[model samples]
Target: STGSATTTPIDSLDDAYITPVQIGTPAQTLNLDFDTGSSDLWVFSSETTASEVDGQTIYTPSKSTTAKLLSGATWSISYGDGSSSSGDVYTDTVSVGGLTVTGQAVESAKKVSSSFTEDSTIDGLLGLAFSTLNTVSPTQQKTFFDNAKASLDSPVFTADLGYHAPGTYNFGFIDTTAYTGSITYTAVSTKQGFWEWTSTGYAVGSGTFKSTSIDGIADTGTTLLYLPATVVSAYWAQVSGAKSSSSVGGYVFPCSATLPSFTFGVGSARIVIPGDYIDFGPISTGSSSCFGGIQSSAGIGINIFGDVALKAAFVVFNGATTPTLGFASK
Candidate 1:
């Protein structure tokens, strides 16, 4: 009734985290991006246009006896980064870890954007957000988690994202040993189809915690932490040579500059992200200028607590009738 899986960063910068998923009869395993910001389990497939296909492993439904077309169903999705894909739908047996679900909607991509084609490390995406966000047309379908939650020991899933390392995703039960200190729980708003919550405030290294309500989504699919311009500016000001650059497209600073840790509040609990975590990497190979992991969300419209923040602590996406989020130091 419960399941567990390992998720690993695709590259050195932790651009995206991918997890292995089993789809269809005989279990064709493919590494898929586990995106919490969207809801559609889509994959690269035999039906994909030949020219758009690169080195990604494709799911061949015709080869699986259990694969059945979802009559008259279709799906298309576009991400915040502009990457998009559209496809026909099929119902098949899907499994993650040891947990299995029958008749799971497995969207097969027929067309994909250039960005997705260039990234061969990701075969497709497995959405973990609410089913209401699913993009299927004619008749919407439930996400794998939605169909499996009923039989699970508990209606919960946890994310332990790592920095340049492998982390884990666990369903049905909370792994007590995965985190330290007591967990701080907060109310979640699924109205936006995201794990949306408000943080009490934030603080620069060794500074006082500011009491401000900052609302944002905990998005595992995103690579960086995005906050209000005021908070971002305050954090960058602490760094000696940091400045916003139009050419660089974000805040950049000398590689030699000393970076400070960032702290955010979840109720009375505080989660601190190490200074090294914010120094994303050099703007280019052998460049002395480094890009920041935290940036202003003014252009993004909504704040996002992405991998940069999630890797600093263990996050629990509690899917109870009245959903809530749990954060714990690890």
Candidate 2:
């Protein structure tokens, strides 16, 4: 299916991502988290005895014919969910969707909290979300994008998350025809780290963003569509039976209501979001009522186009193309 033509923002998602990779010389198939929030690619290691990672999959250094640890390289990651893990750094052969990459620096966590260890559904994370200064670290020597750039004919990696299967996600390759018109290219940031962007504007309900405004950032990491406070309140107010409450910090309305649609602008290419997406309904976190996903975030800068925003279009991350930006599949 085609993804949205514009971008969106998510407040926080409870979902975890997994990616398939063939590690080591003998080729052991393993699953890793494909994280867009960060750029590092790591897995639980066989030597990491301290973490609660028992029964979890590990990439064996001794098994890999080319396994090599940086010796002194160390790493740690703290997620927004109040969980953290630390590990020693090692270099090994890492493959993604059958593509082999050598000398990839990955962390084998030696210490981890209970939250990560207990979740059977949770596994290692592979950050494919756009990386910028926000998620980068001095400790992380390499980014997944930099490692996989040389092999592609188009130098692009696409993250495929089928709505039919929520937690299931895929990475690598691009379907350029997803958008069937003239390609409107935007210059990507050259900053050391942080998925930075320059947006034109956004559209709420059924209307489309004008081709003249540059008003949004296409984000995959953040959950929920975070919009300007005024815009959000105004939009929510328009909902036939909309209700607002501070307990959840967003807008919520009747599931049966005829909700409005929203979209954002990418230069002259306007994106339109589907209406059904507006209804988030009651999730595990809420009781009274929950925002159907879209909400207002007044001071959070421009809108963040997250996976929910991605639902409308196919996304392309062209690493093969030097000037890459998150694009809609039209």
Candidate 3:
């Protein structure tokens, strides 16, 4: 049977989604952020400094009978948002849903940046990107999916990400019942160790869909949809009274303004994101200002198809070969 895991949304901050997975022999459950942008299974742990641990649950490797330290091996990682975590390595059993992978590489954090230390919920990250991106010392490690593929019914997984709602990440098989219409597929480039793909192009508001190719990664870890600055500006220009705000750090508009819908092309398929979803949310309480969900990917080098876009459709991360991406309306 194809393995599956239920993921929950933590919407208060639009931070990201989380899934519970078991690590170690006695099975210490940790709520992890499943990130396709990265390739490391790192968790807040006993190795973390007391001040940096905050409210996150920490894993104690010594307590797990199956935990074995990787001597002289260590790892450190940083995210595009400047968030980062670093620590030593361990090999242990990891279980998600009913599927288990023995001797999975687990990086136990000894330090974390403010982005993680301030979060009271998420414990770590379960990277779903290609194992080639792993940061473990001595040698890079395989991702959970890579390790479990040999034991699966099929070498693939599907991501059913929903807006402000819970979704599921299914492994080994595609759940046809979860999606609508036929799945439209596009080839993915793994040169960057991510599920990177090029969109046919995009259109702002009710404009015709453009054929310009946009290279980006299907990053579930990111919250906002980041595109080239010119593209983002074009979209916001269609919105009344929208302007780039220095204080807000992105494009902002009045909360009551009606935003135009956005259309993006995946292969020959066009996916539309409602204007309401583009508005994101108010910049803050007691203010009529709201931030645009789409932003600029200035320093990031590549565009990121974050949660903002992924949630608009049912996405299948085809891992069978070359890793294709299948998208369809949910």
Which candidate ranks first by lDDT, i.e. highest? 1
lDDT by residue (294-316, candidate 3, tens digit) is: 99998689899998888788888
Give stretches of model 3 more than 4 Å off: none
What TM-scores do the predictions have?
0.98, 0.77, 0.96
Identify the runs in model 1 with alpha carbons over 4 angstroms from their true place: none
RMSD of 1: 0.9
For candidate 3, the per-residue lDDT at 142 reads 93
**Model 1: what TM-score?**
0.98
1 or 2, greater by lDDT: 1
Clashing pairs in 3: none
Q: List the candidate numbers ranked by TM-score, top first.
A: 1, 3, 2
Candidate 3 residue-pair clash tally: 0
At residue 93, what lDDT does model 1 achieve? 96
Q: What digit string (tens of lDDT, one per residue) describes model 1 on residues 104-180?
A: 99999999999999999999999988999999998988988899999899999899999899999998999999999
